[PDB]
Amino acid sequence: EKRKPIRVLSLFDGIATGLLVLKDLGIQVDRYIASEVCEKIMYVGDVRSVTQKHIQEWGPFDLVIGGSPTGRLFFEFYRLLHDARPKEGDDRPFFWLFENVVAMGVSDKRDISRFLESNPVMIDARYFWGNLPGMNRPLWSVPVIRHLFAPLKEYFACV
Amino acid sequence: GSAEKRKPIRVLSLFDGIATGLLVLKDLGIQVDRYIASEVCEDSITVGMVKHQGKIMYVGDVRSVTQKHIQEWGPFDLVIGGSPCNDLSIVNPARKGLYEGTGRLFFEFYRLLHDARPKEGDDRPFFWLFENVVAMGVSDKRDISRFLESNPVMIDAKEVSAAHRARYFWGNLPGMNRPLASTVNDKLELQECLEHGRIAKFSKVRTDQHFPVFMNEKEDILWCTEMERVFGFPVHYTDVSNMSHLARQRLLGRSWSVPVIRHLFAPLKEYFACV
Amino acid sequence: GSAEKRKPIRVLSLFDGIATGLLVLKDLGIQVDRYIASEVCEDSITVGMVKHQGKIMYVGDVRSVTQKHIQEWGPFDLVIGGSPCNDLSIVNPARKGLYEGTGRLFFEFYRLLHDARPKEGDDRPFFWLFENVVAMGVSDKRDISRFLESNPVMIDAKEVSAAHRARYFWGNLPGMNRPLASTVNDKLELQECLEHGRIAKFSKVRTHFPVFMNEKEDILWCTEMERVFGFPVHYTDVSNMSHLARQRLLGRSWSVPVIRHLFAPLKEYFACV
Amino acid sequence: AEKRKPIRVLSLFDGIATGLLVLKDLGIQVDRYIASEVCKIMYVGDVRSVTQKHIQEWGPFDLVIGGSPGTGRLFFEFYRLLHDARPKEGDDRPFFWLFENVVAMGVSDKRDISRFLESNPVMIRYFWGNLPGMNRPLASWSVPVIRHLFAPLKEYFACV
Ligand SMILES: Nc1ncnc2c1ncn2[C@@H]1O[C@H](CSCC[C@H](N)C(=O)O)[C@@H](O)[C@H]1O
Ligand SMILES: Nc1ncnc2c1ncn2[C@@H]1O[C@H](CSCC[C@H](N)C(=O)O)[C@@H](O)[C@H]1O
């Protein structure tokens, strides 16, 4: 019931973008685990090696971020999301973000919006899906993720 | 470890095809509470609609099914599915893989399965089955096994039928890898599947330059009824809706082998009501 | 007026189609000694050869059967036939008539019948049946009746089935004009012939779109037409035939209950199971 | 097996009195000549009015002729008359027939007529018949032609 430092799971293409944005906002970090798709802050290698058991042991996680500024990188992210989400009945704050380029298949955008149950924020240009306050939508990339992540200051401890 | 009357089974069937799951469950004597099927091909929907007398509740495209739908229509005891394989098969040179094309339909399964399983603390029996081809990329198979947290069982219908048909089966059904029982009911040879006045060249048939049957003086391919027997279906199972022989052969070519599904489903008799 | 054991019936079927005659004879319990069929359509031959387990002896084009063949293959007790009608039907404006085109095929029947008739002094029972359409020219009907020395009986399958099909039957079968029995097997309504989840617009089909399904208009399915003409379901589900080929085979066929009505008095002449 | 008797003729020929003139040219006695067209020497009108019973009553017949110097109607009416007038099995009495048509006919028509009559035609016009001399192997108005064709009839029937 009190503000604690954030714990992060990153499938982002830039393994350190999330940590830099978080420290840029002054948010304390108790955990930051980075992974990549290829083909305690910690690098864990291929996402193909991260099992659900690893997600359990390293967790709990408060933030899950992924994407890159083809669709294989989304579903992997999706998997991690599913494995890191709080179970039903747990109301603790949990947030996620997924970025991709606007130049994508219209089918890809529709599929991602369906799977995430959310419509994207367009920023001229990139697409950003998330459940942060302000990313609710109808129907480098560092400072923009900073502004999008700003509401995390009202949920986790700041230094 | 508690006592209760065994209840009929509730099934969610994605990519249902010609309703092999319901046919097999009925043949095992398992009572079916409800059977919700997701399918888009109108020929397959007509087959399942006719041959099972409107028991199936069709819900259309698997991508039109939300988690809210799974909760409101559920609970489900059995979630089964065999997604399209044209973008997974190494035979296709234009295959887009598991993550693109029609391959990503697999994730819909992965999606709805997760929406359908019981919440933590619910010890109710819950079973699932996902089927696909053996001849896919090693990376595709590895990734499917990663997402399902299960390693597949390889079963070939040739052991229990007259068809060469090796498939991967992921799932938590009891005793999936157990040996298959060969009974008298199974037609192990192609000759047993042919119509009167036809001779089989080989023992088993493969799904060129081969017409598998001789009729009098000429060569010939299999008839629709003969493939129905080859795949284990009742004769004339696909004889609906004026569809061409090519349409029926296509429907049967994508389907599950009935005795294989029967082998996989049989242990469900110890969990649900039986007629 | 003499005594003898009833023997199985010997049949010559010209223009046999999908072997309706053998089906009807079996359904009546009449034992069939031999069934020789003349037919040229490979789809029809396949239907008859599969559905009757090689009992039929196919002899090909009716024009390749000589009188010596009738003697050597015979004797026959029953000679049946329904010759093609495309050149007799007034619906066809290119019709060549009874004496030209495929109309003259009738005379082949007329020929073989006369080759199969018992000789003078032979009182053995001998029956024959020739069938064709009602919608032919008056002169063609008069000439068929003159060559066969018989006047036709008009029977419409609509009395014992869900199909409008009025046909002329020449022959000497006992009591061909007697009233038809509407039994319990008879599906008099098109609705009784449809598959699950389809609704019939009309009581009897005349072959627009005769059925509704899920608020969508549709033509008859193959099994539904099989029921409409009185055949067993899936009787024509052989040989990878297109749906159009099945509809063609069924559209040329005899109505099964009508042939059953016509053949039934044969039970008092031949061995029955 | 008896002495020669005058000939009895059934004519469906196009040309009502051709056969009688040819028979008189050969000096053959005629006891009966029944003439008909498709449209004791009697004309009887339309062949549609001629029945098996009329054939039996006016008969017996020794010679049946038909044709013309579509072909289907003419030939099939002739074939009906030939069948009705033919001697029954066991009757070995002399019986002959002839059918003429123009050579300008459908090939299928020629094949069908040869099949029905069980004979191959004499080309000259086409002439089918069973007279001695009209026996032919498989292929690959003016009345003296019928005169020579009918010549063998004076060895089977009485001559004036
Ligand atoms: N988007 C979609 N939603 C639901 N079903 C789909 C679909 N896309 C394809 N399908 C169906 O998925 C099926 C995969 S083949 C599986 C057939 C089934 N196992 C049987 O035994 O009959 C095909 O029939 C195809 O029509
Ligand atoms: N020259 C020929 N010799 C034998 N059969 C022929 C023929 N020409 C056409 N036929 C056949 O004669 C049939 C006439 S329709 C009669 C069908 C049959 N009464 C039934 O109930 O099924 C057609 O099937 C056609 O294939």
Residue numbers in the entry:
A (entry chain E): 629 to 667, 680 to 709, 727 to 781, 791 to 805, 893 to 912
B (entry chain B): 626 to 832, 845 to 912
C (entry chain A): 626 to 832, 847 to 912
D (entry chain F): 628 to 666, 680 to 709, 726 to 780, 792 to 807, 893 to 912
Provide text from the study.
DNA methyltransferases DNMT3A- and DNMT3B-mediated DNA methylation critically regulate epigenomic and transcriptomic patterning during development. The hotspot DNMT3A mutations at the site of Arg822 (R882) promote polymerization, leading to aberrant DNA methylation that may contribute to the pathogenesis of acute myeloid leukemia (AML).
Despite numerous efforts, we were unable to obtain crystals of DNMT3AR882H or DNMT3AR882C with sufficient quality for structure determination, due to their strong polymerization behavior and low solubility in solution. In light of the fact that introducing a secondary DNMT3B-converting mutation, DNMT3A R676K, partially reduces the polymerization of DNMT3AR882H/C, we set out to prepare R882H/R676K- and R882C/R676K-mutated DNMT3A MTase domains for crystallization, which led to successful structure determination of DNMT3AR882H/R676K at 2.48 Å resolution and DNMT3AR882C/R676K at 3.2 Å resolution.
